[PDB]
Amino acid sequence: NAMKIGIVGAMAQEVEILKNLMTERTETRVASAVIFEGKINGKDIALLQSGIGKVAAAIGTTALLQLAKPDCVINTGSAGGVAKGLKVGDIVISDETRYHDADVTAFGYEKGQLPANPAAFLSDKKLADLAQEMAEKQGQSVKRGLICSGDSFINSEDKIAQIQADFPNVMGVEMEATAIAQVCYAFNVPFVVVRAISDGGDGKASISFEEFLPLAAKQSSALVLEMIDRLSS
Amino acid sequence: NAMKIGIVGAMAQEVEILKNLMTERTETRVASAVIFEGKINGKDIALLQSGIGKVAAAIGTTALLQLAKPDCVINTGSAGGVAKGLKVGDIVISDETRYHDADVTAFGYEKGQLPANPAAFLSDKKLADLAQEMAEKQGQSVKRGLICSGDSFINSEDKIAQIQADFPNVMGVEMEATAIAQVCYAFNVPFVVVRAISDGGDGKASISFEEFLPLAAKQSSALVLEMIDRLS
Ligand SMILES: Nc1ncnc2[nH]cnc12
Ligand SMILES: Nc1ncnc2[nH]cnc12
Ligand SMILES: N[C@@H](CCS)C(=O)O
Ligand SMILES: N[C@@H](CCS)C(=O)O
């Protein structure tokens, strides 16, 4: 079997571009997850449409890894840009992922850390470097750092500040990345976030998100398609 | 073809009583999850030790349903008792589960609701009724109602107050019940929470938990054993 790239998006809109380019595409529904398998530019792809949130992402990534057994997982889609300088369309790549809504400090764990897991899931160095390299060659504005996940859509300066008080270096926020990373950590599969900004996570985040989710999916998908051509075996 | 009962606990202490009563026992490790298969009093059992939290419970429950295909799922273990009158060792049965830490109200979803999911997962009425029948039959103190899950160990009166402000009827809090319910909902498998109080989720919760987690595991597991014997 040749290399198989795993790609995960939460919403239909986040996987629509990659999905519509796959040939010999098969569709398998497992509980709340839809897995597409087929080829893009002669490369085997397993594309997961998980649904929104930590548990939907965990169900779908578990089903993806058990059914398609991809060699790596790239989390594509939209994200809230919390770091200064981020604009809608900008690419955000994860160095690491942490939950902004997990708290077992009552037993000495670091904030965001769940028992039996590292406080931070370290993203795959080689995938993250490839994403930033392809992004620079494409001339796409790109930023690399901490992605914080939680079962919340961040839509206020107060909520942004609460997250920054716990995770000062937080670059982007979304609702599945850390959950996908936890599943990939547990199955020992290389993982990286390659998303694009749809909003600033502030009081105008819901309007911005509705207006720029397509842009974020297009910019995110263009970088992932570039990574697909480079990843061979 | 014979009925297979799925049982889920997050911690080793929450599943050890049931693990130690299984015969013809096999052990399978899938990622962060441990699944024991075998029998208790001649009944087929699939027992999952998932690990703590929503994602660990989701990985584990997904693996459990795909591997063992149990006919139902019972979540055993401990919980913070927030409803008035709850004492360590009391049984809490779920009528429904809701995330106290989910918020997509920015798009008009109900507080605690994730898109493509009901705002609350309705527990299986026949399993909850059986749990309350068996509990009352053994003079076991029992309360039935809303269990709220979150990736947090509740350890202060303020955190309880904020959860109660969002979910006024919250009876108990824990970290996996709603995640297991979401997986069981997605796979269309009947589900119910049958846990026991280890603390009050207040400033003393961590110390109480350390002393009463074992009592909670013993009372929860004792009731799940009564359920196993009656199910068919
Ligand atoms: N502001 C935000 N909060 C959470 N997830 C998001 N995905 C895109 N924007 C987001
Ligand atoms: N206070 C608490 N918070 C979360 N999970 C618990 N399990 C038992 N007690 C708990
Ligand atoms: N399902 C929502 C987005 C939640 S992240 C919407 O379509 O607007
Ligand atoms: N590590 C804790 C339990 C996790 S909440 C303990 O040993 O009591």
Residue A103: DSSP 8-state: B
Phi then psi for residue B175, to 5 deg, are: -125, 5
Phi then psi for residue A132, to 5 deg, are: -65, -40
Phi then psi for residue B34, to 5 deg, are: -120, 125
- The Cα–Cα gap between A35 and A162 comes to 35
Cβ(B8)–Cβ(B180) under 8 Å? yes
Residue A115: DSSP 8-state: T
Environment class of residue A20 by beta-carbon count within 10 Å: exposed (0-12), middle (13-18) or buried (19+)? Answer: exposed
Apex A9 CA angle, A100 and A123, nearest 5: 55
Cβ(A40)–Cβ(A22) under 8 Å? yes
Query: Which amino acid is present at A209?
Result: F
- The Cα–Cα gap between B198 and B22 comes to 25
Chain breaks in chain B (C to N over 2.5 A) after: none
- The Cα–Cα gap between A6 and A46 comes to 5
Q: How many CA atoms lie within 13 A of A75 on its CB side?
A: 37
Cβ(B33)–Cβ(B51) under 8 Å? yes
Atom of ligand 1 nearest to the CA of A174: 5
Experimental determination approach used: X-ray
Residue B154's closest CA among B218, B90, B197?
B197
Site of tokens 């997605």: B186
- The Cα–Cα gap between A44 and A167 comes to 37
What domains does chain B contain, in order, with CATH numbers? 1-232 (3.40.50.1580)
Instruction: Choose, from A37, A174, A199, A226, the residue flagged as catalytic.
Output: A199
Cβ(B196)–Cβ(B219) under 8 Å? yes
Q: How many CA atoms lie within 13 A of A222 on its CB side?
A: 17
Distance of CA B90 to CAs A29, B7, B85, B139, B144, Å? 40, 19, 9, 11, 11
Environment class of residue B190 by beta-carbon count within 10 Å: exposed (0-12), middle (13-18) or buried (19+)? Answer: middle
* C-alpha R_g of chain B: 16
User: Is the minimum distance from the CB of B199 to ligand 2 under 6 angstroms?
Assistant: yes
- The Cα–Cα gap between B79 and B195 comes to 6
Residue A222's closest CA among A139, A150, A122?
A139
Residue A205's closest CA among A175, A178, A166?
A175
Question: Quick one: tokens of A40?
Answer: 């893009």
Residue A174's closest CA among A191, A156, A198, A158?
A198
- The Cα–Cα gap between B105 and B113 comes to 8
H-assigned helices in B138-204: 157-166, 177-187
Cβ(B120)–Cβ(B97) under 8 Å? yes
Residue B14's closest CA among B70, B96, B57, B78?
B78
Residue A74's closest CA among A232, A192, A202, A226?
A192
Query: Which amino acid is present at B53?
Result: G
Atom of ligand 1 nearest to the CA of A155: 1
- What is the resolution of the experimental data for this entry, in Å? 2.1
H-assigned helices in B28-141: 54-67, 125-137
- The Cα–Cα gap between B13 and B32 comes to 16
Q: Is B133 a catalytic residue?
A: no
The nearest alpha carbon in chain A to B204 belongs to A106
Atom of ligand 4 nearest to the CA of A115: 4
Q: Per the CB < 8 Å rule, is A53 touching B206?
A: no
Cβ(B124)–Cβ(B74) under 8 Å? no
Separation of A153 CA from ligand 1 center, angstroms?
Answer: 5
- According to DSSP, the β-strands at B72-81 and B170-174 are antiparallel
For ligand 3, atom 1, the nearest C-alpha belongs to B115
Residue B3: DSSP 8-state: -
- The Cα–Cα gap between A137 and B35 comes to 47
Q: Per the CB < 8 Å rule, is A55 touching B56?
A: no
Question: Quick one: tokens of B209?
Answer: 């938990």
Residue A90's closest CA among A216, A223, A218, A226?
A216
3-state secondary structure B190-223: CEEEEEEEEECCCCCHHHHHHHHHHHHHHHHHHH
Interface mutation vs chain B, best among A29, A55, A160, most B CBs within 10 Å = A55
Q: Of the ligands numbered here, which is closest to the C-alpha atom of A109?
A: 4
Cβ(A9)–Cβ(A71) under 8 Å? no
User: Is the minimum distance from the CB of B107 to ligand 3 under 6 angstroms?
Assistant: yes
Residue A47: DSSP 8-state: E
Interface mutation vs chain A, best among B61, B62, B178, B209, most A CBs within 10 Å = B62
Residue A40's closest CA among A10, A15, A63?
A15
Question: Quick one: tokens of B33?
Answer: 């999850």
- According to DSSP, the β-strands at A121-122 and A43-49 are unpaired
Q: Is A151 a catalytic residue?
A: no
* C-alpha R_g of chain A: 16
Residue B230's closest CA among B92, B124, B131?
B131
- The Cα–Cα gap between B57 and B156 comes to 24
- The Cα–Cα gap between A76 and A217 comes to 8
Query: Which amino acid is present at B166?
Result: D
